[PDB]
PDB file of C-alpha atoms and ligand atoms in Angstrom:
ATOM      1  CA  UNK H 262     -58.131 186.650-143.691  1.00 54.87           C
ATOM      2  CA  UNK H 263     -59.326 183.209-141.952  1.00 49.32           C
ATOM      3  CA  UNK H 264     -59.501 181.253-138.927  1.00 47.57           C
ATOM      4  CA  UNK H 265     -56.371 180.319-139.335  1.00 48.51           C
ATOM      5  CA  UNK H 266     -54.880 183.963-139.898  1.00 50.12           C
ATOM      6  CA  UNK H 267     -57.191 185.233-137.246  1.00 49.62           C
ATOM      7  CA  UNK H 268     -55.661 182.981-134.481  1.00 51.80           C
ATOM      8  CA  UNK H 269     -51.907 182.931-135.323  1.00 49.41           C
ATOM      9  CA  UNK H 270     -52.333 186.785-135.017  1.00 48.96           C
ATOM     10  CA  UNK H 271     -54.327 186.490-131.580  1.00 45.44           C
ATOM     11  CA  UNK H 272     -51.949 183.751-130.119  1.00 46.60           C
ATOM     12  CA  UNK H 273     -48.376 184.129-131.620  1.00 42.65           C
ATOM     13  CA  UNK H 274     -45.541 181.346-131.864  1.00 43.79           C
ATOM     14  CA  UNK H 275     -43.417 179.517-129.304  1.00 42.46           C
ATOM     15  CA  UNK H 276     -41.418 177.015-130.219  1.00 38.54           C
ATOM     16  CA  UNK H 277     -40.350 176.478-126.167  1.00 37.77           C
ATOM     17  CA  UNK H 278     -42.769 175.871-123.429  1.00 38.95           C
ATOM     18  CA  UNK H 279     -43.892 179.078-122.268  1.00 41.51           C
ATOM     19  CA  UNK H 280     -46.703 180.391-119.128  1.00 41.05           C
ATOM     20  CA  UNK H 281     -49.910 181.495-121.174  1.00 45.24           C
ATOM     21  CA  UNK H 282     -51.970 184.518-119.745  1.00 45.68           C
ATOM     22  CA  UNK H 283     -53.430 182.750-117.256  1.00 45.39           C
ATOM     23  CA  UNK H 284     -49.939 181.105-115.820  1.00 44.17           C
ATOM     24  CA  UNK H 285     -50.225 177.667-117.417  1.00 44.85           C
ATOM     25  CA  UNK H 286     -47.719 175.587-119.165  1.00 46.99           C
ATOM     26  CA  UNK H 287     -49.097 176.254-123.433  1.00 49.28           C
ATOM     27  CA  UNK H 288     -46.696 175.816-126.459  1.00 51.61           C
ATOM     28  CA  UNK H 289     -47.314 176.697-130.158  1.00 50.94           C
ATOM     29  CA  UNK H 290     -49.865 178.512-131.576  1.00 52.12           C
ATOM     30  CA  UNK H 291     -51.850 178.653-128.220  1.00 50.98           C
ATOM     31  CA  UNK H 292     -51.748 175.116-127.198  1.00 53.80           C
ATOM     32  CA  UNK H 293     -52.226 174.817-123.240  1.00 54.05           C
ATOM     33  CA  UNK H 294     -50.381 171.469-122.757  1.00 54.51           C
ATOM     34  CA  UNK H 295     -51.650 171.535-118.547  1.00 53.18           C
ATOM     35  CA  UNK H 296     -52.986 173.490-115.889  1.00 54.31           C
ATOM     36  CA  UNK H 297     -50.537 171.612-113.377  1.00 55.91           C
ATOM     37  CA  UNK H 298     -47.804 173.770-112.036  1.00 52.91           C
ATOM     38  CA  UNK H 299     -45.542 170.737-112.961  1.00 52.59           C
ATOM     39  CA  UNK H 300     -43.155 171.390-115.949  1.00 48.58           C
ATOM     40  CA  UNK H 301     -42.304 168.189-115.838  1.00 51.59           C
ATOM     41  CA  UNK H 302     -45.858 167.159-115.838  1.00 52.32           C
ATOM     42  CA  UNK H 303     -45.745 169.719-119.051  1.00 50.87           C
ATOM     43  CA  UNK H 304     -42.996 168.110-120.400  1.00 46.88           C
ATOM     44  CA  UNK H 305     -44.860 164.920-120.071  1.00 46.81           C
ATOM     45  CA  UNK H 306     -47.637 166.161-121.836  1.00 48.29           C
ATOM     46  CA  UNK H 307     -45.588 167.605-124.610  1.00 46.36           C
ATOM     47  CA  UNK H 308     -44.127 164.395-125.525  1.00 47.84           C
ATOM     48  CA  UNK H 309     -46.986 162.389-125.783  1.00 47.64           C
ATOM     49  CA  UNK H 310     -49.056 165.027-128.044  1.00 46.81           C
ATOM     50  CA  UNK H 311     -45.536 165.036-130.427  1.00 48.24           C
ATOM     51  CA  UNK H 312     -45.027 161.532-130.071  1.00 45.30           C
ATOM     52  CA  UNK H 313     -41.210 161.805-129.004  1.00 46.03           C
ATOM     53  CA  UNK H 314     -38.514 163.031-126.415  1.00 46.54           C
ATOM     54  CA  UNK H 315     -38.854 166.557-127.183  1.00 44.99           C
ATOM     55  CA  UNK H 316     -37.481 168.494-123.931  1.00 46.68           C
ATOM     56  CA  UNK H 317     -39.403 170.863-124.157  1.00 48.62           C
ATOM     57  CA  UNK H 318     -38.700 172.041-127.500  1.00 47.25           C
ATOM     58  CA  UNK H 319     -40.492 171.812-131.176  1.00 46.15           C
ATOM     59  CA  UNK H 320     -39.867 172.338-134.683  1.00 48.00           C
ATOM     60  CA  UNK H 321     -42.452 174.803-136.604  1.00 43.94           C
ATOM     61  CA  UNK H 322     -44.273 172.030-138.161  1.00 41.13           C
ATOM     62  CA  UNK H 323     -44.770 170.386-134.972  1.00 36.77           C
ATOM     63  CA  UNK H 324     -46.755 173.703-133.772  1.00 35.80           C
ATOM     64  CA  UNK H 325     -48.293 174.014-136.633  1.00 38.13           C
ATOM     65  CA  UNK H 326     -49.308 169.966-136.560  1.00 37.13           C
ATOM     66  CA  UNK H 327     -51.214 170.835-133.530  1.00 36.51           C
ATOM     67  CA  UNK H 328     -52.969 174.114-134.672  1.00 36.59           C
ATOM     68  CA  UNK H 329     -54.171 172.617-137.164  1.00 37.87           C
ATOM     69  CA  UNK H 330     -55.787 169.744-134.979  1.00 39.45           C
ATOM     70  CA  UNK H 331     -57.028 172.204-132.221  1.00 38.99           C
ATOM     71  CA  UNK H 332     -58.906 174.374-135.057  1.00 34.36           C
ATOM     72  CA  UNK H 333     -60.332 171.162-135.980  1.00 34.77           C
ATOM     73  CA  UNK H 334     -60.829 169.490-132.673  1.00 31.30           C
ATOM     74  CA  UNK H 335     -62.618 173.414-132.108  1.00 29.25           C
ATOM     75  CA  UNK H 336     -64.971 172.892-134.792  1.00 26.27           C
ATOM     76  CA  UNK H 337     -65.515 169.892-134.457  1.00 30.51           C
ATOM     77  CA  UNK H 338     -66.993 170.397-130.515  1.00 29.57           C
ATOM     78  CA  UNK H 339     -69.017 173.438-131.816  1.00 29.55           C
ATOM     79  CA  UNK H 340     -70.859 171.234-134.390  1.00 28.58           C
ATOM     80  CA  UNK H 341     -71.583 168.993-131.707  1.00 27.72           C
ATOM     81  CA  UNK H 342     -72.446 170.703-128.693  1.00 25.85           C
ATOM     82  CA  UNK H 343     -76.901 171.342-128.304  1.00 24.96           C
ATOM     83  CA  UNK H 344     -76.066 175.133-127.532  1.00 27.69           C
ATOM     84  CA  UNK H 345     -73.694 176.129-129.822  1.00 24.09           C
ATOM     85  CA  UNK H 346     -74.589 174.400-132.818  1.00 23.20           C
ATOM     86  CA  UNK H 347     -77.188 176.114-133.672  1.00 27.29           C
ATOM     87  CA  UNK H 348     -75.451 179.856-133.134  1.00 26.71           C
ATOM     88  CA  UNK H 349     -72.970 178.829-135.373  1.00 27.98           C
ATOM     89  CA  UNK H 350     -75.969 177.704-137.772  1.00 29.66           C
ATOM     90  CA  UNK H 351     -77.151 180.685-137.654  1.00 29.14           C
ATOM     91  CA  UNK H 352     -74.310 183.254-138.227  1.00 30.53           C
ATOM     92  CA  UNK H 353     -72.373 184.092-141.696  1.00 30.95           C
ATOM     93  CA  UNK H 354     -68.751 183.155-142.470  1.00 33.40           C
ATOM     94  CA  UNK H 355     -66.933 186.039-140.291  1.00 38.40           C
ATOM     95  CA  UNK H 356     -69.010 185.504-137.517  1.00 38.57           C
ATOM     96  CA  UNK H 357     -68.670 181.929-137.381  1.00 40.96           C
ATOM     97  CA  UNK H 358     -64.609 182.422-137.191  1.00 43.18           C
ATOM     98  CA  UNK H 359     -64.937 184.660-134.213  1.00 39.62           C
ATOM     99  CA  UNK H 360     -66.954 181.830-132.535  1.00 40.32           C
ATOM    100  CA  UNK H 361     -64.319 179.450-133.276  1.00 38.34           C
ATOM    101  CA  UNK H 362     -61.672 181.749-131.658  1.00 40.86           C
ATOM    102  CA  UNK H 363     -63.595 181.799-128.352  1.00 39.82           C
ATOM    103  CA  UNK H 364     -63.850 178.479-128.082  1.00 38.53           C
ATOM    104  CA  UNK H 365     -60.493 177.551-129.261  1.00 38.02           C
ATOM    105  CA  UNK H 366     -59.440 179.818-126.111  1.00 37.62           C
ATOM    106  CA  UNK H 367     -61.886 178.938-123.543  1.00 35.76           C
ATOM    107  CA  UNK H 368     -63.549 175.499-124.504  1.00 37.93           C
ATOM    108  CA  UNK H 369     -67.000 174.584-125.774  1.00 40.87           C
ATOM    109  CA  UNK H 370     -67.931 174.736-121.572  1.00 41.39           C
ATOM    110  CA  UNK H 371     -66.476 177.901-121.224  1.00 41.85           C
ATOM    111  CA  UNK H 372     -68.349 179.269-124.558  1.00 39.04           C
ATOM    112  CA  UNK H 373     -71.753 177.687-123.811  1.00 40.83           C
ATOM    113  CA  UNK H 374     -71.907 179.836-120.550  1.00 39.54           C
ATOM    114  CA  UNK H 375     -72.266 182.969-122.358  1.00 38.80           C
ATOM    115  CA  UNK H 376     -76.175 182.256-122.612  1.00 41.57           C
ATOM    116  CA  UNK H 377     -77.028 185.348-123.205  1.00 40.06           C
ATOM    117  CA  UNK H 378     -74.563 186.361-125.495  1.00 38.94           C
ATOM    118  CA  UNK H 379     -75.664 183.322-127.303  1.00 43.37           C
ATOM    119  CA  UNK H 380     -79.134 184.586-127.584  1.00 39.64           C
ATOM    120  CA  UNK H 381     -78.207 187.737-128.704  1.00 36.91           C
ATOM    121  CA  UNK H 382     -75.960 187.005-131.458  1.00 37.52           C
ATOM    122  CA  UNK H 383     -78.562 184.369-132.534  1.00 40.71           C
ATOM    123  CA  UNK H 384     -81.320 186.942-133.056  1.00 38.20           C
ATOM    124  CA  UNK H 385     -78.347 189.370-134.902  1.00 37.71           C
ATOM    125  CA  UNK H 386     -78.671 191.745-132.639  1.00 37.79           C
ATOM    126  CA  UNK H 387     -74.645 192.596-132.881  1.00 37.25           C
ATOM    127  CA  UNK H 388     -74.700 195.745-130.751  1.00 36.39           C
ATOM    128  CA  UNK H 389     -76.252 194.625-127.882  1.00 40.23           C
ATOM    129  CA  UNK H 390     -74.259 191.386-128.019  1.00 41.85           C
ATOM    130  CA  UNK H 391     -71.101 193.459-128.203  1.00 44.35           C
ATOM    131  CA  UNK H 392     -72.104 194.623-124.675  1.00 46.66           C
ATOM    132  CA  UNK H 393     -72.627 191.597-122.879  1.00 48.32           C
ATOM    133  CA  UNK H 394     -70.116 189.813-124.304  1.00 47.97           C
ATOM    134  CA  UNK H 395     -68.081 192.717-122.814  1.00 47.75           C
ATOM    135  CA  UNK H 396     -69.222 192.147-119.295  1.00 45.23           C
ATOM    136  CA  UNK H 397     -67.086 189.538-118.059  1.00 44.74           C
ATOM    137  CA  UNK H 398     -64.167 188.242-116.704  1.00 40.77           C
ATOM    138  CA  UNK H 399     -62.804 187.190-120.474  1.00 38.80           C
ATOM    139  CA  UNK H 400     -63.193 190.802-121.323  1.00 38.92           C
ATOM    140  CA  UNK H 401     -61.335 191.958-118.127  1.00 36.20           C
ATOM    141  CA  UNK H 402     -58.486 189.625-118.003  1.00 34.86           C
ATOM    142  CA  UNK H 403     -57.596 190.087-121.796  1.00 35.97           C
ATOM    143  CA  UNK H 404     -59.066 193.178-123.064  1.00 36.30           C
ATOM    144  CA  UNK H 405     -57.175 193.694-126.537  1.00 34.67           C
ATOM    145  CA  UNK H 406     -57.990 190.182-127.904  1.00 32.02           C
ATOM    146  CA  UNK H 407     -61.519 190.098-126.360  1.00 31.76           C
ATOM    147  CA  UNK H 408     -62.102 193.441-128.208  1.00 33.72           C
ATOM    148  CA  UNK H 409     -60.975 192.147-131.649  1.00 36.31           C
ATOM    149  CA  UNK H 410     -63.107 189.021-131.462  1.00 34.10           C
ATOM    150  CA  UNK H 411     -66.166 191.112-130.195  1.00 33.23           C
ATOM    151  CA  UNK H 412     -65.755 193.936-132.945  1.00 33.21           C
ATOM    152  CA  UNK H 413     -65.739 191.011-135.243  1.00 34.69           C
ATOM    153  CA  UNK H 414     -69.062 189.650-134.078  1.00 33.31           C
ATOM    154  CA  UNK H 415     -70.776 193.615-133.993  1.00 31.84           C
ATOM    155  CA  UNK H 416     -69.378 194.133-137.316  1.00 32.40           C
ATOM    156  CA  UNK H 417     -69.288 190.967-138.887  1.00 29.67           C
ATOM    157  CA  UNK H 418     -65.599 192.333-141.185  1.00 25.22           C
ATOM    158  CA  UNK H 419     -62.183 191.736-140.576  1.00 24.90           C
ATOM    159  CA  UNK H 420     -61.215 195.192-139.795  1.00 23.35           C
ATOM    160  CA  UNK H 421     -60.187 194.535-135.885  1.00 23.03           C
ATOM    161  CA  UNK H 422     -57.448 192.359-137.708  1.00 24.60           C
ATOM    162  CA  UNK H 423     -56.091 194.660-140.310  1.00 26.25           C
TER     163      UNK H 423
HETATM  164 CL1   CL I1301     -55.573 190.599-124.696  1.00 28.22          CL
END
């Protein structure tokens, strides 16, 4: 299993532009195009990150085009961001993916929020940063994928995904 694995499991496939969880125009493997309530807007979007007149529609490789630049975009904002940097330092291989996948979802903002959480994992203490982690709105909105990521952090394997 890897990052890669680990999110096309957590977010599926669409190939047409559907609502995500939250009610906002995504397509792909998870990629929010908007928050607007516009599908035209959405459409808009969609045709500038493909690069042509799509209506609304995209080939596998298109999605997968984008994954593969969110993972890195993903990444690439943990490596730079004062607060998360140096969890991410800190933590081995599985660990690391399972901060990726929170911040693919909710941004390096949202991620850097979870202070405490941060703390916690930083010091390894996985239990008790299995319990924050669980008290919040993340955990409450979308309580099946915020339980695989944080049984991946107190466990550090992959079995939440097998
Ligand atoms: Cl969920």
């Amino acid at each position: 299993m890897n990052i890669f694995e680990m999110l096309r499991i957590d977010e599926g496939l669409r190939l047409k532009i559907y609502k995500d969880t939250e009610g906002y125009y995504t397509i792909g493997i998870g990629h929010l195009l908007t928050k607007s309530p516009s599908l035209n807007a959405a459409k808009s979007e969609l045709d500038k990150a493909i690069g042509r007149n799509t209506n609304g529609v995209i080939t596998k490789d298109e999605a997968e085009k984008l994954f593969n630049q969110d993972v890195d975009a993903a990444v690439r904002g943990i490596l730079r961001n004062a607060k998360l940097k140096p969890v991410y330092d800190s933590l081995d291989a599985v660990r690391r993916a399972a901060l990726i996948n929170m911040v693919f979802m909710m941004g390096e903002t949202g991620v850097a929020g979870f202070t405490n959480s941060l703390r916690m994992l930083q010091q390894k203490r996985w239990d008790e940063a299995a319990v924050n982690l669980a008290k919040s709105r993340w955990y409450n909105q979308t309580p099946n994928r915020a339980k695989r990521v944080i049984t991946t952090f107190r466990t550090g394997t992959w079995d939440a995904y097998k």
